[PDB]
Structure formats: C-alpha cells, structure tokens
Amino acid sequence: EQVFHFYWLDAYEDQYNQPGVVFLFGKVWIESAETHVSCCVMVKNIERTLYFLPREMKIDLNTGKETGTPISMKDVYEEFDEKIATKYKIMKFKSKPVEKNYAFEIPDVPEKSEYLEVKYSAEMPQLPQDLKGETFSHVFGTNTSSLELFLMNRKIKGPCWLEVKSPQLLNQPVSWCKAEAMALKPDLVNVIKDVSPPPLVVMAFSMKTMQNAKNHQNEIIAMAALVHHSFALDKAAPKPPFQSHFCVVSKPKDCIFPYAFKEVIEKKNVKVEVAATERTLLGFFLAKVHKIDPDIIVGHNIYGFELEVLLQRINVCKAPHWSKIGRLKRSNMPKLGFGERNATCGRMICDVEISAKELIRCKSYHLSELVQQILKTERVVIPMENIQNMYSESSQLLYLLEHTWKDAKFILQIMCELNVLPLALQITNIAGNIMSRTLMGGRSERNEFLLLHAFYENNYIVPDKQIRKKAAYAGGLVLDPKVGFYDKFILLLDFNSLYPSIIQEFNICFTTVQRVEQIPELPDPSLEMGILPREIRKLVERRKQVKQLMKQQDLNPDLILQYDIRQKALKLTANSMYGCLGFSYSRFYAKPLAALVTYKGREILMHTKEMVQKMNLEVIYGDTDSIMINTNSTNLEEVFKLGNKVKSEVNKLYKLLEIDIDGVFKSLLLLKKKKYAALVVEPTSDGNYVTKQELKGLDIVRRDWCDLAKDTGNFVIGQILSDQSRDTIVENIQKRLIEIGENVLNGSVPVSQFEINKALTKDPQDYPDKKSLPHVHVALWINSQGGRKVKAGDTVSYVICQDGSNLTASQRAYAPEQLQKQDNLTIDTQYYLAQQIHPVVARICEPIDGIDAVLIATWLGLDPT
RNA sequence: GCCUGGAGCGC
DNA sequence: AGGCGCTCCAGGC
Ligand SMILES: C[C@@]1(CO)[C@H](O)CC[C@@]2(C)[C@H]1CC[C@H]1C[C@@H]3C[C@@]12CC[C@]3(O)CO
C-alpha cells in the first residue's frame, strides 16, 4: 500500500489529555535535500490490556465463601461483561482466553494459568488496581502506560529504525518537526535492523544569569551555543565538535550597554546578537532552537538550575512560543525534573554533570573541576558581582560573552571526552528503554525495561508498576588482612564477573528459585535456564563476540573505539542486573534472589581461600571476589607459573565461573581491610618489567582530607615502597615531615592545599545539628549569601580558621574566599598539623618500624601528649 | 567500646 | 532515581 522509514530517538505520552497516544520523535532522510530532518510520528489506538485471573471456585463477595460452582473462562467474561464493564463504563472491548506464565511477588497466583485478556480503548475509564470479583481474584495491567505497551508489543529497544505502514496526514501540525505523520494503530509500526544510525544535531549551550538590583529575580543576560548538524553516535566525535555557533547578549534593566558596543562588535566580527530586552533574548534563543532543531541539548547543571531558570524566565517575560524548546506544540507550561523533562519532550537533554558522576570520580562536579580533571585546562570563574561592572566597558562585556562561549565549548568537549552520547546509545539499545531517560541517570529503570522485554517475549504477565539506608541482607566476604609490608612478589587472583556468573552458573531467577531473611535453595540442575540467566548469558556472548572482533586485522581503525564502548556498556548492564534485585523500590525487587547471589558469593570465596591454603600457599587478603597470595618468592617467572597453577585448579571446579591472574606486586603495604598501597608489575621484554604505584582506600585517595595531608602521605608512601634501606627511608620521612611543619608555620603553603571537601547527603536546610558540621555550616553561608545555591549532591570546599572565638575546630569552618578576603580570619595551623597531616601519616606508618605516633607529632612541632 | 550525628572509599 | 562491607570524625557515656 504505502510506507516510510524513520529513526526514532524519543517518545512522549500525555495520559491525561491524549490517552492511547504515543508521540515518537526522530529522523527521516529526505533524498531531495540530501540530509536527515526531524520527524514526529503520532501512533494512536494503543489499547489498554488487562489480564483477569479466574478463581478456582466462584465466591459470594458478601459471605466470602465458595458457592460450590467451579469457575470457567465464560464465568469471568460474563462477570466482566455484565457487572464490571457496566459499573465502570466500558462500551466496547475485545476479550480472549490466553495462557500466561507468572513468577512474581503476589501469592496465590499460579506459575502458569489461563487468563481473560480484555482489550479496550484508553479513552474509557481505568479499573482499580485491587479490583476483585466473584469469578476472578486479581487483574493485571490496569495502570500500564501506553508507551510501555507500545514499546513492549512492538519490541522496540532504544533508538532504531522503524517502518511505518499506511501513514496518515494530520489536519494541522502537532509538532515543531520538519515532517509529521500518523499511524492509526500500533501494529503499523515495525522495527527494521539492517540500517545504520543517522547522525544527530547536537547543541551545547551555557548562559549567564544576574541577580536583579532591587528584589530577588535571576535574569538571563547572555547565552552561548555551539552546534553540529552531523554528529554520529556510532563513531568518534567530529573534530572539531561543532560547525556553527551563536551568541546573544542582553542587559538587565538598570544598566545600559557600554558606549559603542555595537561598533566594537562590527569590528571584531563576532556572531553576537545584542538584544534590547531579556524577552527579546529568550525569543531569539527559542527561534534558533526551532530553526537549528537539535535532537540533543547538552549543558552543565541543566536539571539542577539552568533549565528551570530558563523556563521560569520564559514565562515571566512571556517570551513567544516556549514549547519550541521541545518538539511538540503545547499551550500551558508546567513547572516544579518532571515539568522539565516534559518541557523538552522530543529533544534529549544531556547534562555533563550527571554523566560525569556516573562515569568518573572527582572531588566535585562543578564545571571547573570537570574541566580541570577531564580536559586538563584551567577555567576562569566569574562571580555574579563582577558582572555588572563589566557592563560599563565594552571590552568587559565582550569578555563576559567570550567566557560564556568558552563554557559551552568546554561542556561540549567534556561530553565528547567521556564518550557520553555513544555510550548512552549502546546502553539504551541493550536495556531497551528510552535514551533521554538513560541520559538522566538512574539504573533501576534501565534494568526494569530490559526485564520487561525479556518477560514479555517469554509470555509472562509482568508486575504492575507500583504506586543511605541500613543494609537489608548479607553482602560480600572480606577476608582478614595480615597487615604489614612485603618484599616478595604477591599474587592477586580475581574472578571475572563473579555475581553475573554466579547467576548463570546456578540458574538463579524469578522463575527458578522458590521464595516467600532466609536464603532460598538453589534450583534443581534439572530445570531449564531461567529468564534472568538467559539474559545475562546473552550479554556475555555479545561481549565475547566484540572482544574477538577487536583482535581483528586489516580493520576499519575507528571501529576499535566503538567495540570498546559497546564492550563496557555490556559489562555495566550485566553488573547492574544484580544490584537491582536488591533495590527495595525496583519493579522487580527480589531480596531473596539478591541475598542468594551474595551467599554463593561468600561461599565460593572461602572454598577458594581454603583451597589455596591446602596448596601450602599463604593467603594474606581477600575481598568479595579476589585473593591475595604471598609467594614469598623473588622469581617472577615462577610466580606466574604458580598463579596459572592455582588458576587451573580453581577453574576446574566450575562450568562458567573463572578466576584469573589480575596482577602481581613487587612490594605491598597492607594497612587494613580495603586499604593498601602497592607497586604493580607491568611486564615488558625478557621477563623484565616496569613498576607503577597503585593506591586503594588510603586517606590519600579521599576527598575529605586536604591536599597538604594527602601530598605528604603520598610522599611517605613512595618512600616506604622504595628500594632504599629501611633506615634511608625513616630518615627521609623525618627530614620531609619537619620541613612541612616549618613551611606550614611560616606561611609558604598555598591556601589551596588547606581546603577540605565533603559532599552533602541532604540539602543544607535538612540538617538539625547544623553548626557542628563544617561543610553543612559553610554551605548555608554560601546559599544565603549569594547566587547559585548548594544542594544535595554538591560537594562543599572549606578550611578551618582561627576565628578568635575559641570554638572547636568543627565550628570554625569557612570558604576559601571568605578566608583570603576577610582579615580576622587566618589558617588554624595547629589544626592542620595535628588533625590533618599527623592522622594520615600516623596510620600509614603504623606497621613501620622506626616510625611512631608521638615521634611524628614532634617532627611537626607538636606536644606529644 | 558503644551510641548518636556526619563523611566515601572498597568490591 | 541498583547492593552491602569497612573505616574515619565529632562528641558524650
Ligand atoms: C554497584 C553494583 C550494583 O550491581 C554495580 O553493578 C557496579 C558493580 C558492583 C559494585 C555492583 C554491586 C556489587 C559489586 C560487586 C563487584 C562490583 C559490583 C558488581 C559485582 C562485582 O563486580 C563482583 O561480582
């Protein structure tokens, strides 16, 4: 008849105003224009689907007793037809008996069983979730959304190509896309899998807001954006990351642009559009968004500030057509990211801050710390105050705009550097969810979707969607450490994905483990692979295919970064599978399964520790899935043969679980459980090797210890692991420490190294014992004093100062700025030497002969007692 | 040691 | 807006 193709990226549903309809936004190829343009496809008539569970025996709801008559499918039909449909207003519907499996948390529901499937328009009323009757004890699917029913039934798993048959035109345009179309029923949409992903339109932006002179509004005075119209998600980022860009500045209401501004620009030839009013600016922006038509908008702290601000201002200034910031034509703007995630429907939002938190560790995720760590460059800062003063001289405004441009360019580079977009696609293509959601973070949901697809495809009824804490079960086993320094090589054996393998090994699934604190029994080896095991099995196969492809030759060179990305996404998925089992709010929550996994975990660890011991080998440490062996040897080649020897022995015990040589140490300083320092062997040629320092858990790697303490401690660590004689070392450490103590007293240590960082678990206002907590105290100051406001998740930087108020150190906390700018404030040198440096060095040198607590305190110039 | 509150490393 | 195990600090009993 007729058909068109399109690559979908995002989906949206308005249950309240447009039930039974799902809007899909993506890309269509236009041959005439030789480029892809945005497209919106409206899918209608996605019907509610219910599953009524027939009773074994008919019940009288008044007496609560069987009536002697057994139940047949027809009984359910009739009760629904006569008493249910009527009472709740359902004119039409289709029904049909179907067989469905079940394996979830509602008791008295058979593993397999017949059900009365009832399908009817989403426009007619929704039944109560607890609805019961004379012929049925429960009904599933009452609250299932259309998006879920559509994605599950059509087997759509993340962005991909769709074939839409019998497309229809619309009276009037419903979206801001270049092409629109409508499908009358969902079975008109099909997935096609042998066509590559089209490149997207990416737009990175940043803005500068300014607090208004009189009262408290935060106006947008400048916006910068970088853009690229052909950004592949299946290959390396384009160089450069953008092709075009634009800048728009405005002025608050008390200020006036510096004289000659327009002219100063005409000269420099900068694409800076100078707008008279904030409202004009906003409108300029919204139009570029509408004209550029990005598929993805990337920024920093978008969901935490920028986006909400942009929307509020758009409303106050009554800027024209706010819904263009999204892809669907809408009238009313919802607020508070709910109203936000909805505000941009059709366009994916990538917030680098969120993406960084999921990909790397830092002491803070502010743009400057990310730029430093990720891009390795310094990023200037502009305090909200200095802004106005910049409106007096043109060269200053131009600097401000240029800065904003630099910010958007950094955000774009970070996004490129972390490979966020390509990873997100692979992740979404695996979980089978929605990419804008994958980008918002939250693993539980990617997990839900993956399982929902798995169970749907295997004929199971699935759970209805339902409408730090203290541990709820046993975790991993942590062997007791034989603290101390070692000179002989150390063997580190590791299991490859213990948890995921445990799950396949012992066939642990919702469909195989009987369950009701009490670890359930493993299933009988006779039963077939459970649904969950098969899913992990698949991830493991695909990851093997990929690593094998990577070993290939005469290959397209860029393909290797691609395989590497998919490989990691396949790993992240499999591992999250476990953690979801243990999440109380997960749609597929199942503590029993989780706990059974960690159990066989501990068990296997011990049988392993024991076995290495029966081989007359010393086992000095072990954490959840690893075993550290002290060979007492000095012959590297022999060490390896030993490892491979133990290896062969353990791997002989299982069908899928495998242990391997994760490495070898030349020297190791084991302080406590989950805390050590070591020199790692990196073989080269002829049995030779180089050595690299690796730290784990020591205060040195934490963010809640100033750099002064961390740098000193690392020094001591380098010494300790060295080749020098024990005495050479002990001397060097003393030499150094005493120096540090002086440098601290004389004031030669940079004010930066005294900074301590801590992240707030709650919003600074939700802390009762406030005052006694440094970071929280400092956060309140910052919030109540200036612009941006610290909130849960944010890391606060501070330093202890001499107030001259005789309060404990924990009550004399200030911001680095509050220190250098204020005079009566001065670094509490005493605190840092005794409460920072000393503690760290003390705990590191504990197993060291020659070094002691009182001995260290004197070197720094402290009274031993 | 424990308790209360608060940190974030480890797998 | 996936888990649990193991230190560290401030303060007081
Ligand atoms: C945090 C979480 C939750 O599943 C996530 O998948 C990252 C890996 C994770 C930390 C896991 C919790 C259990 C951890 C044990 C380690 C690391 C681990 C996943 C399994 C392990 O790799 C050992 O099997």
CA distances from A408 to A227, A246, A414, A570 (A): 10, 11, 10, 31
CB within 8 Å of A569: residues ≥ 6 apart: A423, A426, A427, A430
Fold of A1-46+158-197: OB fold (Dihydrolipoamide Acetyltransferase, E2P) (2.40.50)
A575 CB inside 7 Å of strand B: no
Q: State if residue A502 touches ligand 1 by the CB under 6 angstroms criterion.
A: no
Domain boundaries, chain A: 1-46+158-197, 47-157, 198-468, 469-697, 698-865
Query: What is the distance in A from the centroid of ligand 1 to the CA of A512?
Result: 22
Where on strand C do bases come within 7 A of a protein Cβ? 1-11
**C-beta atoms surrounding A674 within 10 Å:** 13
Specify the residue with its C-alpha closest to ligand 1, atom 4.
A579
Resolution of the determined structure in angstroms stands at 2.5
Distance CA A75, CA A69 (A): 10
Q: Is A477 helix (H, G, I), strand (E, B) or coil?
A: coil
A498 lines ligand 1 (CB under 6 A): yes
Among protein residues, the one with the nearest Cα to ligand 1's atom 10 is A575
The residue type at A554: D
**Structural domain A698-865, CATH architecture:** Orthogonal Bundle (1.10)
Element (H, E) at A175: none
Measured between alpha carbons, how far is A764 from A69 in angstroms, rounded to an integer? 63
**Which residue type sits at A595?**
A
- CA at A834, C1' at C8: how many angstroms apart? 15
Query: What is the enclosing helix (H) or strand (E) of A752?
Result: none
φ, ψ of residue A640 in degrees (nearest 5): -60, -45
User: Shortest CA distance to A798 belongs to which of A705, A700, A713, A699?
Assistant: A705
The residue behind tokens 């700025």 is: A817
**Residue-wise over A393-414: b if at least 16 C-beta within 10 A, else e?**
ebebbbebbebbbbbbbbbbbb
**Ligand 1 contact via A373 beta carbon (within 6 Å):** no
Q: Beta strand pairing status for A296-299 and A94-101?
A: unpaired
- Choosing from A575, A586, A598, A624 the residue with most ligand 1 atoms within 8 A of its CB, the one to mutate for a pocket test is A575
CATH number of A198-468, picked from 3.30.420.10, 3.40.190.10, 3.40.50.620, 3.90.1150.10: 3.30.420.10
Neighbours of A144 (CB within 10 A): 19
Cβ A25 vs Cβ A175: under 8 Å: yes
A576 lines ligand 1 (CB under 6 A): yes
State the Cα–Cα distance between residues A373 and A589, nearest whole angstrom.
37
Contact (Cβ atoms closer than 8 angstroms) between residue A562 and residue A234: yes
Total Cβ atoms within 10 A of residue A514: 8
Hey, what are A688's tokens? Answer: 């030779």
Strands A189-192 and A66-70, by their bridges, are unpaired
CA atoms within 13 A on the CB side of A459: 9
SS3 content of chain A, % helix, strand, coil (to 5): 40, 20, 40
- Pull the structure tokens for residue A256: 């006036």
Query: How far apart are the C-alpha atoms of A512 and A522, rounded to whole Å?
Result: 8
Q: Please state the atom number of ligand 1 nearest to the C-alpha of residue A601.
A: 24
Residue bearing tokens 């108020």: A805
Q: How many residues does chain A have?
A: 865
Q: For A233, which DSSP code?
A: S
Non-local CB neighbours of A831 within 8 Å, separated by 6+ positions = A800, A809
CA of A494 to C1' of B10 (A): 15
- The CATH fold of domain A47-157: Alpha-Beta Plaits (3.30.70)
A578 lines ligand 1 (CB under 6 A): yes
Find all residues with CB under 8 Å of A859, minimum gap 6, and list them.
Answer: A734, A737, A738, A741
Q: Nearest protein residue to B9's C1' (by CA)?
A: A697
In angstroms, the first-to-last Cα distance of chain A is: 91
Give the helix ranges, DSSP H, for A466-530: 498-505
- Locate A782 and state its tokens: 């910052």
* Tokens 């948890």 sit on residue: A499
Please give, chain by chain, protein residues whose CB is below 7 Å from any atom of strand C.
A 337, 440-445, 447, 469, 471-476, 478, 575-576, 579-580, 582-585, 594, 598, 624, 671-675, 699, 772, 808-811, 835, 839, 843
